[PDB]
């Protein structure tokens, strides 16, 4: 599914809808959702 | 935030002299103006671009990183 | 948002040429020559080259506003002499002068070494 | 015959030099010139891959647009804008590849030493990062804390300072003429007496001082230029002289050509 990361832990969860929103390890609250895989373009100006 | 590359009015790189600047300040106890020179840092573009730099990156990394891999 | 690019400085966009020339109605024998994608580096240089010809009457040059890069030379020569022939005899004399400084400068370099 | 050359120092990245018999437009076009038309290599495009550091992803890409290039063999090299290839090749580019962790418990510092040049250079003397500092390491680009990663990929394309002041190879140009002020084309301001409140300049040294009972020379015009162009290291500074003046009499050429066409 969709993966997060635990604000505190910083352990990398997956997700699904129907998913309380807590960190499996330590019980935060807190989720930060992962960086996107397609790559991003920068103009180095 | 972090040492700027360039010297921003003439663009002087700069930015491989910030540990060197401060490796003189503090290891061999020289005041500023001549480990600027010592650098070569001639003209006050520069010397204000090294002198004046905050670098506020190390308190950044204080924070535990939010993506820890 | 409204910023042009900044390659619009020096290169010449669709339909638009390097020079342009229009006759002068105000005086007799002048031309007045928009040159595009240029600036005061070109125009200055082009100027006082005119302006040490001897049958140059007129030559002057203005960048009528900063946002875009072009000027506007105007040259005026003695009767029987085209504008356009003392354009070229300036651009001929500068790059022989710049043909001459760059071999003096590479013969003075390499009499160098502490280099 | 012409403009005359004589230089006074010479330096890896210093050259002092005195043109003479030449006129002020020729001498402040080729100063221009050499500030801003002269091709180089810089970083152009950043595709990051992971950035877990402290700094946003366009700072680190504007810090990386500013590290030095190898520009030696840069005139080999196209324009991408002018070069047939869809995004970039290997005829218009250089790819480098930055790719640092922090493995270490103190900070791990990314220097312009670790960009890695990945695009066949086809041995072409372009792309290396310039280094200059007796440590060895370049420009500072990031810090990383334990844990934190930086993976990104650089383009590097041909541009000139009039696109963008990254590819500005010249940094400061000194620049003088008439260091004693015959030629009147100052009115020094004072307080009391000009002469003692105005430092004189390192260059009166090179010129006759006025006779202080002489007439004004309303002939003499302004010739024999000081000028000190430094390098910022993409190019030797004797290269930074010769491609300006190269450059300028590029420019009128094709003005000629232009004109001979039309
Ligand atoms: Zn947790
Ligand atoms: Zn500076
Ligand atoms: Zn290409």
């Given at each position: 599914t969709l993966k997060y990361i635990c604000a505190e832990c910083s352990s990398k969860l997956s997700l699904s809808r129907t998913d309380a929103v807590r960190c499996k390890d330590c019980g935060h609250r807190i989720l930060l959702k992962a960086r996107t895989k397609r790559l991003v373009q920068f103009e180095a100006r | 935030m972090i040492v700027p590359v360039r010297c921003f009015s003439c663009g002087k790189v700069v930015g491989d002299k910030w540990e060197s600047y401060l490796n003189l300040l503090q290891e061999d106890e020289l005041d500023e103006g001549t480990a600027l020179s010592r650098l070569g840092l001639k003209?006050?573009?520069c010397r204000r671009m090294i002198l004046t730099h905050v670098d506020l990156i190390e308190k950044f990394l204080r924070y535990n990183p939010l993506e820890k891999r | 948002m409204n910023a042009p690019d900044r390659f619009e400085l020096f290169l010449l966009g669709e339909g638009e040429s390097k020079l342009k020339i229009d006759p002068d109605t105000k005086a007799p024998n002048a031309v007045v020559i928009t040159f595009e994608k240029e600036?005061?580096?070109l125009g200055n240089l082009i100027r006082a080259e005119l302006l040490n010809d001897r049958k140059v009457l007129f030559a002057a040059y203005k960048v009528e506003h900063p946002?875009?890069?072009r000027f506007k030379l105007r040259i005026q020569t003695t009767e029987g002499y085209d504008p356009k022939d003392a354009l070229k005899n300036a651009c001929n004399s500068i790059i022989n002068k710049l043909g001459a400084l760059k071999t003096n400068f590479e013969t003075?370099?390499?009499?160098?070494t502490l280099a | 015959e012409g403009p005359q050359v004589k230089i006074?120092?010479?330096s890896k990245d210093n050259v002092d030099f005195i043109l003479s018999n030449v006129d002020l437009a020729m001498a402040n076009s080729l100063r221009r010139v050499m500030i801003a038309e002269i091709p180089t290599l810089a970083i152009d495009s950043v595709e990051v891959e992971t950035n877990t550091t402290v700094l946003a992803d366009e700072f680190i890409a504007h810090r990386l647009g500013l590290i030095p290039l190898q520009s030696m063999d840069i005139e080999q090299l196209e324009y991408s804008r002018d070069c047939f290839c869809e995004?970039?090749?290997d005829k218009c580019s250089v790819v480098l590849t930055l790719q640092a962790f922090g493995e270490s418990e103190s900070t791990t510092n990314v220097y312009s030493k670790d960009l890695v040049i990945v695009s066949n250079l086809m041995g072409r003397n372009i792309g290396h990062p310039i280094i200059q500092d007796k440590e060895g390491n370049g420009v500072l680009?990031?810090?990383?804390?334990?844990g934190q990663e930086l993976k990104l990929t650089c383009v590097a394309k041909k541009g000139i300072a009039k696109e963008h002041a990254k590819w500005g190879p010249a940094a400061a140009i000194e620049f003088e003429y008439d260091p004693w002020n015959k030629l009147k084309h100052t009115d020094y301001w004072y307080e009391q007496d000009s002469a003692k409140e105005w430092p004189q300049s390192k260059n009166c040294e090179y010129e006759d001082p006025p006779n202080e009972g002489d007439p004004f020379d309303y002939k003499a015009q302004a010739d024999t230029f000081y000028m000190n162009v430094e390098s910022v290291g993409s190019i030797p500074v004797d290269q930074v002289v010769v491609r300006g003046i190269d450059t300028l009499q590029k420019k009128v050429a094709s003005?000629?050509?232009?004109?001979?066409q039309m």
């Open positions: - | 003209r006050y573009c | 600036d005061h580096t946002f875009f890069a003075e370099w390499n009499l160098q | 006074r120092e010479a995004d970039h090749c680009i990031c810090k990383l804390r334990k003005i000629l050509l232009a004109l001979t």
